[PDB]
């Protein structure tokens, strides 16, 4: 052996909408996502 | 040339007259100018070859 | 011959490596909304050993954080210890990197995840028979239950 | 209407080498390299909520 | 070696010397049916 070393691999369950805003004027508009349900973003899972 | 396994050395004289430190900075894949005038001279190097 | 493997010298020099190149996390996964933990950031060297705090008043340290809404931060009176907060319900993605404020050169942590933390409705139902309902519920860890 | 000097964005792209990706005022700029899927993430690097 | 008075030269056999790893990510964070391949760094990449 000329080394060991250890990756900590996290598995996190349901899906939830995410926006950072709930109001909007007439003639406004604001981009939704979706986040999984232990806070799984885009970047993780939406490959 | 910011590709993994490129790496970059600054080279000083014999004489000792390139203080690159005092000229330049090399980080993060950018390339610094300092306070003062002078000449630096560097090699772009890759995979330890 | 078959044992000189073993011979050192004992005038037993010192080695000292010049250059931050990898970064551990020291945490829990889990804290109540109103509450508090603390996060300590571990820097280590080319060769594995870890810096002494000593040396992390000359680190550029700088965490990273998705919803600091849901977990908040602050750094310590030590530069190598920072205070968490929670705030309200949910999930939050956290890591750090240092650099060093001469060459530019940076490392980062792993990213890692910190969860912030039910009742049901109605509390009180009345049918007749053959009649049917669904039980709703509120608050507390979807994502893990 | 005018975001102002302090408005910094950073990207991250979460299969490397299928894209590469390059910032300028409030524009991203990609460019395929690999076939494949991958996330594009951006932010407003001092504010990254 | 070269001869300073003549240019003539002999050479070696060629030996090998080894010097004596690390992963990236040190930490992941997946979701279930994820997928990735771990990189690493150093070691001996030519009898590793």
Same mark, same amino acid.
């Given at each position: 052996i000329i080394g060991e070393d250890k990756l900590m691999v996290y598995v996190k369950t349901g899906i939830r909408i995410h926006s950072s805003i709930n109001k909007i004027l007439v003639g406004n508009e604001?981009?939704?996502?979706?986040?999984?349900?232990?806070?799984?973003?885009?970047f993780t899972y939406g490959t | 040339l910011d590709k993994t396994g490129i790496e970059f *050395?600054?080279?000083? /004289?014999?004489?000792? &007259? &390139?203080s690159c430190k005092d000229v330049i900075d090399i980080g993060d894949n950018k390339i610094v100018s300092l306070d003062?005038?002078?000449?630096? *001279?560097? &090699?772009?190097?890759? /995979?330890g070859r | 011959q078959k044992h000189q493997q073993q011979q050192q010298s004992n005038t037993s020099p010192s080695i000292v490596q010049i250059s931050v190149h990898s970064i551990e996390l020291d945490v829990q996964d889990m804290v109540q909304v109103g509450? +508090? $933990?603390?996060? $300590? %950031?571990?820097?280590?060297? !080319?060769?594995? !050993? !870890?810096?002494? +705090?000593? !040396?992390?008043q000359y680190m550029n340290i700088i965490p990273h954080i998705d919803n600091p809404n849901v977990l908040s931060m602050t750094q310590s009176s030590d530069s190598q210890v920072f205070t968490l907060k929670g705030l309200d319900q949910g999930l939050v993605t956290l890591s750090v990197t240092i650099q060093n404020p001469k060459t530019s050169f940076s490392a980062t942590s792993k990213t890692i995840q910190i969860q912030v933390f039910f009742r049901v409705s109605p +509390?009180?139902?009345?049918? %007749?028979p053959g009649g049917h309902f669904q039980i709703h519920w509120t608050g507390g860890a979807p994502i893990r239950q | 209407t005018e975001y102002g000097s302090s408005a910094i964005f950073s990207s991250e792209v979460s299969n490397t080498?299928?894209?590469?990706?390059?910032?300028?005022a409030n524009v991203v700029t990609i460019k395929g390299i690999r076939a494949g899927l991958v996330t594009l993430h951006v932010y407003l690097k001092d504010m990254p909520h």
């Open positions: 604001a981009k939704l996502r979706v986040v999984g349900a232990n806070g799984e973003t885009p | *050395y600054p080279l000083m /004289d014999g004489h000792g &007259s &390139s003062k005038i002078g000449t630096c *001279y560097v &090699s772009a190097v890759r /995979d | 509450d +508090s $933990i603390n996060l $300590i %950031v571990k820097g280590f060297s !080319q060769n594995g !050993q !870890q810096f002494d +705090s000593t !040396q992390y +509390s009180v139902l009345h049918l %007749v | 080498g299928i894209i590469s990706s390059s910032i300028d």
